[PDB]
Amino acid sequence: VHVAQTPRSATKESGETLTINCALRDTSYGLHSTAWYRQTPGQSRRDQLTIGGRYVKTVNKPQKTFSLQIRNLVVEDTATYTCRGWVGGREGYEGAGTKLTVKP
According to DSSP, the residues that pair with 21 across neighbouring strands are: 6, 67
Distance of CA 64 to the CA centre of its chain: 14
| Distance of alpha carbon 13 from alpha carbon 15, whole angstroms | 6
Rg of the chain (C-alpha set) = 13
Look at the chain and report how many structural domains it folds into: 1
Neighbours of 80 (CB within 10 A): 17
Question: Using alpha carbons only, what angle is made at residue 65 by residues 68 and 86, rounded to the nearest 5 degrees?
Answer: 90
The parent domain of residue 40 ranges over: 1-104
Experimentally, how was this structure solved? Answer: X-ray
Q: What is the resolution of this structure in A?
A: 2.5
According to DSSP, the residues that pair with 96 across neighbouring strands are: none
